[PDB]
Amino acid sequence: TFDMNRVIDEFDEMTRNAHQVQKQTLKEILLKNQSAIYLQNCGLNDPEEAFKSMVPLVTDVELEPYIKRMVDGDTSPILTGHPVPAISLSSGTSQGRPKFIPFTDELMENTLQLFRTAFAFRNRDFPIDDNGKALQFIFSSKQYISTGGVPVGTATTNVYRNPNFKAGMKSITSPSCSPDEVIFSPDVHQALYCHLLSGILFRDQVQYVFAVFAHGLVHAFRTFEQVWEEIVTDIKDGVLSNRITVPSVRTAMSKLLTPNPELAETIRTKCMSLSNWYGLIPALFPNAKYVYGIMTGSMEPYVPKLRHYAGDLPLVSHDYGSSEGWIAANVTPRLSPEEATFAVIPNLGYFEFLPVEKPVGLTQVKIGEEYEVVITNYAGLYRYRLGDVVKVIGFYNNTPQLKFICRRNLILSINIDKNTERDLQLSVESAAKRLSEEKIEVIDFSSYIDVSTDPGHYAIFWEISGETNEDVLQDCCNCLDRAFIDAGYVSSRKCKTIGALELRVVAKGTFRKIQEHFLGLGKMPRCVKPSNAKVLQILCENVVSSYFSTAF
Ligand SMILES: CC/C=C\C[C@H]1C(=O)CC[C@@H]1CC(=O)N[C@H](C(=O)O)[C@@H](C)CC
């Protein structure tokens, strides 16, 4: 039974005792998983001491073969003491291959604990009506079964399809406007339309608006700009647009629709009153208290447009975690996304921090210093290098408050996509075999994030060893686009939040000219940063042709 003050007091005591809770949490993780051959092979059977001397830092790549066994249905103890109920398909890759992370019942408990904690602080500073609803733009369009018989989904999908999700969120959320059939629609574009319509149908009750990521909220209302008159028509007629073809979705939404020309008129008058859609969100939902979602890190570029739609509504930052697990909660919800920091929850894992040198404990980190995060938790992860670099902004009682700084080895990112030099090189090598058919080779390559388009897209620069046809180059272009298998990139391309990959072919001698540039001053950049004007200049002025992927 949820009690706001009780929840806050519990978080307070835990963070006052963060050092002790860290140690107790490690001991419990090690007890639960002691039969895991990964742990047995380290010499485990001074528990904290033994742990740090016997267990090596490890990377996703090192864990790949172990996790592969779990995805293939091995139920003996490998990374966990008990068989996992699901596997999470993560963003990013494992050396260019799909990256999987175990999803355990404990991770579900953690999710519920963190949501409850964050809600308590948020509802303290931004109290909502408990007879209202929320507009929640969430999606779980798919969860497949591995060949070994294990469910595989994204982390959010594993959360949304958990048997404890509805009951567990009941007390610490405002009820969604959307039918479950919308959330689980196999077609996310239809789901999004229906979320928008559902929100409008209950607009007076909507207490806040949520999506996991800021770019999702922005995409939602950009979409509204396109379909608003269609929604007004659906409401006026009490008939769902023929755009919606998923039968279970049509059925569910039809129960909510009856002819309402009055509401339709209100909405039409309201939309036409806006100036370039400024303040669209509070206009549609005049009782919403805030907009909620991840506003930080890779989402920072989306905040200006989100503010535009949000008008004067507070933007509240959603918490810090990934497919690997949760780390930190926003307990200062009134702070803008620029000032937002996240307090580590001391029982969600045994956290270590590599100085940006060997790792220090949670209560050992220093204000103003940057560290790479190291995770030991209930996801089968022991001293796992997350690759996230954080800065310690301060302490909330004895737990550090963190700001995300950067992700190591990342060169290509628009929103939720994460691609490295190796991923780019692999995509190039894939697409190059279409060229090899023509006895043509890739002389060199680079790339660039083009955010002049909406949405932004990847641009790849190629110089090739000979002239070829448009069809060949079109194929190479499509292949480059499909060769990026990172789940984040694929998810965005499908949801249209990342545009068609563009292949720009440059004139012969273009890359040598870049060499000449650097030689006349005295390692080819694989993604050209916006500030690298001299290099960008040489590439752009030598583009001779341009192609856009017809994939997705
Ligand atoms: C136990 C952890 C449970 C949930 C973590 C996720 C959240 O609910 C908030 C942050 C996080 C987003 C995430 O997992 N994003 C995916 C990813 O980037 O891997 C993406 C492939 C979309 C699902």
**Which residue's CA is the nearest one to ligand 1's atom 12?**
322
CA of 100 to the centre of ligand 1 (A): 12
For the CA of 491, the nearest atom of ligand 1: 21
Whether residue 163 contacts residue 247, with contact meaning beta carbons closer than 8 Å, is answered with: no
Whether residue 487 contacts residue 89, with contact meaning beta carbons closer than 8 Å, is answered with: yes
Q: Tell me 419's DSSP state.
A: B
| Residue 13 one-letter amino acid | E
The CA-atom distances, in angstroms, between 357 and each of 16, 155, 304, 389 are 28, 32, 38, 14
CA of 322 to the centre of ligand 1 (A): 5
Beta bridge partners of 213: 294
Q: Is 247 helix (H, G, I), strand (E, B) or coil?
A: helix
User: Residue 1 half-sphere exposure, CB side, CA atoms within 13 Å?
Assistant: 0
For the CA of 320, the nearest atom of ligand 1: 10
**Which residue's CA is the nearest one to ligand 1's atom 11?**
322
Whether residue 196 contacts residue 217, with contact meaning beta carbons closer than 8 Å, is answered with: no
Q: In whole angstroms, give the CA distance from residue 204 to residue 286.
A: 7
Beta bridge partners of 19: none
Tokens, residue 247: 């039968």
Q: Tell me 26's DSSP state.
A: H
* C-alpha 355, offset from chain centre: 25
Whether residue 361 contacts residue 337, with contact meaning beta carbons closer than 8 Å, is answered with: no
The CA-atom distances, in angstroms, between 338 and each of 296, 317, 408, 417, 552 are 8, 10, 22, 22, 35
For the CA of 107, the nearest atom of ligand 1: 1
- Beta strand residue intervals within 66-214, DSSP E: 86-94, 97-103, 133-137, 144-145, 151-153, 206-213
Instruction: Please tell me if the CB atom of residue 416 comes closer than 6 angstroms to any atom of ligand 1.
Output: yes
526 closest CA partner among 462, 476, 433 = 462
Q: Is 513 helix (H, G, I), strand (E, B) or coil?
A: helix
b/e per residue 527-541 (b: at least 16 CB within 10 A): bbeeeeeebbebbee
Q: Which residue in the block uniquely carries the two structure tokens 């409401």?
A: 235
Q: In whole angstroms, give the CA distance from residue 542 to residue 510.
A: 7
* C-alpha 30, offset from chain centre: 29
**N-term to C-term CA, the chain:** 46
294 closest CA partner among 216, 227, 378 = 216
Strand ranges of the sheet holding 342-344, from the earlier edge strand across to the other edge:
320-322, 325-329, 342-344, 399-407, 384-396, 370-376, 350-355, 360-361
Beta bridge partners of 412: 419
CA of 465 to the centre of ligand 1 (A): 42
Q: In whole angstroms, give the CA distance from residue 109 to residue 1.
A: 15
Query: Torsions phi, psi of 539, nearest 5?
Result: -65, -55
b/e per residue 310-334 (b: at least 16 CB within 10 A): beebbbbbbbbbbbbbbbbbbbbbe
Domain ranges of the chain: 1-552
Instruction: Please tell me if the CB atom of residue 90 comes closer than 6 angstroms to any atom of ligand 1.
Output: yes
> Would you say 515 is a known binding-site residue?
yes
Query: Torsions phi, psi of 16, nearest 5?
Result: -65, -30
**Which residue's CA is the nearest one to ligand 1's atom 18?**
91
Task: For residue 261, say if its preceding peptide bond is cis, omega within 30 degrees of 0.
Answer: no
Q: In whole angstroms, give the CA distance from residue 263 to residue 267.
A: 6
User: Who's near 169: CB < 8 A, 6+ residues apart?
Assistant: 112, 115
Q: In whole angstroms, give the CA distance from residue 501 to residue 481.
A: 6
CA of 444 to the centre of ligand 1 (A): 35
Mutate to test the pocket of ligand 1, among 89, 158, 322 (most ligand atoms within 8 A of CB): 322
CA of 487 to the centre of ligand 1 (A): 11
Whether residue 492 contacts residue 154, with contact meaning beta carbons closer than 8 Å, is answered with: no
| 86-94 and 151-153 strand pairing | parallel
The CA-atom distances, in angstroms, between 483 and each of 252, 413, 478, 504, 549 are 37, 15, 9, 17, 12
In the chain, breaks (C-N over 2.5 A) are found after 45, 356, 522
Q: Which residue in the block uniquely carries the two structure tokens 């077609």?
A: 187
552 closest CA partner among 479, 450, 486 = 479
Tokens, residue 517: 């540039």
Whether residue 215 contacts residue 299, with contact meaning beta carbons closer than 8 Å, is answered with: yes
Instruction: Please tell me if the CB atom of residue 488 comes closer than 6 angstroms to any atom of ligand 1.
Output: yes
Solved using: X-ray
Count CB-CB contacts under 10 A for residue 76: 10
| 97-103 and 151-153 strand pairing | unpaired
> Would you say 91 is a known binding-site residue?
yes
